[PDB]
UniProtKB/Swiss-Prot annotation:
Effect of residue 139 to N: Impaired nuclear focus formation, reduced interaction with PIAS and increased sensitivity to cisplatin
Official protein name in the record: DNA cross-link repair 1A protein
Organism: Homo sapiens
Tissue: Expressed in brain, heart, kidney, liver, pancreas, placenta and skeletal muscle.
Record field: transmembrane: none
Taxonomy, superkingdom: Eukaryota
Family that this chain belongs to: Belongs to the DNA repair metallo-beta-lactamase (DRMBL) family.
Residues spanning the signal sequence: none
Induction: During mitosis. The mRNA encoding this protein contains an internal ribosome entry site (IRES) in its 5'-UTR. This 5'-UTR generally suppresses translation while specifically promoting expression during mitosis, when cap-dependent translation may be impaired.
Subunit structure: Binds constitutively to TP53BP1. Binds CDC27, which is itself a component of the anaphase promoting complex (APC). Binds PIAS1.
Amino acid sequence: TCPFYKKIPGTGFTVDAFQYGVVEGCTAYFLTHFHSDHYAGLSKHFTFPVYCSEITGNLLKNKLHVQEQYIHPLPLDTECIVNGVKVVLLDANHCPGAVMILFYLPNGTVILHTGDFRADPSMERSLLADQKVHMLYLDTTYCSPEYTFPSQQEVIRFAINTAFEAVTLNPHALVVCGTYSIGKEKVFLAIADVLGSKVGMSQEKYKTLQCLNIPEINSLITTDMCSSLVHLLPMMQINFKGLQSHLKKCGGKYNQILAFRPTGWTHSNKFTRIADVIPQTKGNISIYGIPYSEHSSYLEMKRFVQWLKPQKIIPTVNVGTWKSRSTMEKYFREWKLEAGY
Ligand code: NI
């Protein structure tokens, strides 16, 4: 049964609410982005109108084989009427296709649901800037001040420089990169660009990536593993054993592996700088774990809520415990007192 923080009050609308079967009183189901926690339940036997972005729609048609008559793609930064109500889609600065949604309720109330997001000062010059938000449904994944990480550009900087140095020192090494889902494609697209290579990958990852409207993409990725010195692998293979095993498949082409595990936040960030990050190494194989976040840090989150000045905030991540809720409400009150709204 559908939780309260996935219902839009005063409408026939739900948000990322697909795993509960037939939601009583729902006429238009919304999907913020193509990640498994959010789409769980969708398939070729889904028969209600789904609203989403274009890219999200491609992933529904091609990866879940949801039928074409039910996918309603909506363009961004655009006022659209759905079941008598004005919606707007804005960039979530998360993974590809990821949106936030602005709902204009018939009784004058105005709701922002954030989906998943990495807050950015650029969001302060979107269509949000024109007006007031009475309720905010907020991705609170890193809502505690100990959650610090670098900017995406610092992380990619470090990944480029690392990879170009190792391969200029050893022209016979292979670079591998981890993935489970969509998102973080810059990790491997930038490493492959500094290095002269296309990216090598499986048939399933290649077709996921063919859904994402990335320009010049046919020139960047391939299913021919042998032609490539950057390779994509499932995240669970980025371990000494998984790699050893992959190094054998390549057949005396490479004699060294440098691997990148993109993680979210991890405790080591509290003490060490991006600059100072060091690998695990066994013999001829090395693994870097890198804090490439697609979620707001604490500092980013707070800044966005203070510019937005909502009347009421409802969290959507970390909702399960009394101690987590209590913690999050304490930061909402400090933010509000400080900015004075
Ligand atoms: Ni997500």
